[PDB]
Amino acid sequence: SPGIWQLDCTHLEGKVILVAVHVASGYIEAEVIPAETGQETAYFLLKLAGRWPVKTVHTDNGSNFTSTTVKAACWWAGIKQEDGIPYNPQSQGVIESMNKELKKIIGQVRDQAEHLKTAVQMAVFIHNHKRKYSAGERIVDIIATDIQ
Amino acid sequence: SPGIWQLDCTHLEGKVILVAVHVASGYIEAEVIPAETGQETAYFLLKLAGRWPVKTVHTDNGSNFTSTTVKAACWWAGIKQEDGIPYNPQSQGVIESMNKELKKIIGQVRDQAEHLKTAVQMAVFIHNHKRKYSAGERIVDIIATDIQ
Numbered sequence: 398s399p400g401i402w403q404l405d406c407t408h409l410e411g412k413v414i415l416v417a418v419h420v421a422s423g424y425i426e427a428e429v430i431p432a433e434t435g436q437e438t439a440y441f442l443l444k445l446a447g448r449w450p451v452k453t454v455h456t457d458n459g460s461n462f463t464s465t466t467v468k469a470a471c472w473w474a475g476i477k478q479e480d481g482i483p484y485n486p487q488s489q490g491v492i493e494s495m496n497k498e499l500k501k502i503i504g505q506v507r508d509q510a511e512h513l514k515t516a517v518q519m520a521v522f523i524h525n526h527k528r529k530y531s532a533g534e535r536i537v538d539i540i541a542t543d544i545q
Numbered sequence: 546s547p548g549i550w551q552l553d554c555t556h557l558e559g560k561v562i563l564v565a566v567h568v569a570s571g572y573i574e575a576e577v578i579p580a581e582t583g584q585e586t587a588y589f590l591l592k593l594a595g596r597w598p599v600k601t602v603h604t605d606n607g608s609n610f611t612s613t614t615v616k617a618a619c620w621w622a623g624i625k626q627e628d629g630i631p632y633n634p635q636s637q638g639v640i641e642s643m644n645k646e647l648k649k650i651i652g653q654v655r656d657q658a659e660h661l662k663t664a665v666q667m668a669v670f671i672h673n674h675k676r677k678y679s680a681g682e683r684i685v686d687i688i689a690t691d692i693q
């Protein structure tokens with residue numbers, strides 16, 4: 398459970414927002430990309446796995462699940478690539494709600510930033526710091542407990 | 546202290562590698578940028594602070610220490626901006642050695658990747674996972690201990 402992440406892709410301003418969610422904590426990392434290619438997804442996963450102990454990734458769609466470049470990146474980084482089917486059907490709505498929530502935060506800051514990418518990183522910040530414990534606190538606690 | 550980071554800028558292939566080091570653990574995040582502008586540094590710090598609890602940043606030079614954009618980003622993200630003078634003179638060589646180490650790792654992978662940015666993220670991965678405890682383990686343990 399501490400090593401499980403879910404990929405998520407949502408759209409805004411004709412652009413693509415790629416999100417990785419640490420399932421047990423709700424902690425996220427995100428980036429803006431021109432389009433969701435294998436190359437972009439691969440690079441995003443490499444960055445993620447260099448920063449957090451990523452054991453398993455539930456991919457966001459069949460194209461990324463099939464992508465040879467994504468498979469290569471997962472091999473390189475020691476990531477088990479899995480499908481992202483909501484076997485628990487509440488897993489659709491939880492992601493839908495996060496996307497809605499992210500876009501809402503982006504709207505609240507959009508005017509502060511000239512570029513969408515800045516607004517997205519402001520949203521990551523606000524999300525991970527928000528007291529609900531914060532997601533940042535939860536991921537650290539979960540991984541630390543696993544270590545020791 | 547758990548919230549203290551140091552900025553570091555090094556050069557390779559006519560490009561700039563911007564690094565943030567968590568001082569107590571040796572954990573790093575890094576990016577390739579065309580040049581070290583206030584705007585790029587500001588964005589990098591925003592990303593960092595959205596992902597880890599960044600309380601204090603020792604800046605890498607006077608230009609970033611003075612930059613109005615960097616100051617704005619530090620205000621936004623709740624970061625105390627400080628100078629990075631090696632008051633302990635071993636603080637120069639520790640960074641020099643990390644830069645040498647990073648460039649060495651980049652050399653070991655450079656052929657695997659077409660783009661420098663990919664090689665840099667491979668280097669971040671290798672660095673943070675390297676057993677010496679790993680830096681990834683240390684940062685989580687340090688921050689978790691602080692939380693509790």
Ligand SMILES: O=C(O)c1c(Cc2c[nH]c3ccccc23)ccc2c1OCO2
Pocket residue numbers: 436437439440441443465466467469470471473657658663
């Ligand atoms: O498969 C890729 O090209 C790719 C990879 C994995 C990888 C790079 N070199 C390799 C050489 C041998 C095996 C895998 C790789 C990681 C991040 C990326 C990638 O593309 C962009 O971001």
Ligand SMILES: O=C(O)c1c(Cc2c[nH]c3ccccc23)ccc2c1OCO2
Pocket residue numbers: 400446447448449450543544673674675679680681682683685
């Ligand atoms: O795998 C790591 O060294 C690493 C760790 C801690 C850890 C040590 N053993 C483990 C075995 C399983 C899971 C995590 C670890 C923490 C953060 C990271 C890491 O890599 C990048 O971000």
Ligand SMILES: O=C(O)c1c(Cc2c[nH]c3ccccc23)ccc2c1OCO2
Pocket residue numbers: 509510515584585587588589591613614615617618619621
């Ligand atoms: O100061 C910036 O422009 C900047 C900032 C801080 C910030 C943005 N809007 C604001 C509006 C009011 C106050 C500060 C800001 C963060 C990240 C960045 C930045 O530039 C690129 O990455």
Ligand SMILES: O=C(O)c1c(Cc2c[nH]c3ccccc23)ccc2c1OCO2
Pocket residue numbers: 525526527531532533534537547548594595596597598688691692
């Ligand atoms: O600020 C957070 O909630 C947050 C935390 C927990 C934390 C808050 N203050 C601290 C002061 C010191 C140490 C941890 C925290 C952890 C990771 C994060 C966080 O945000 C981004 O990554």
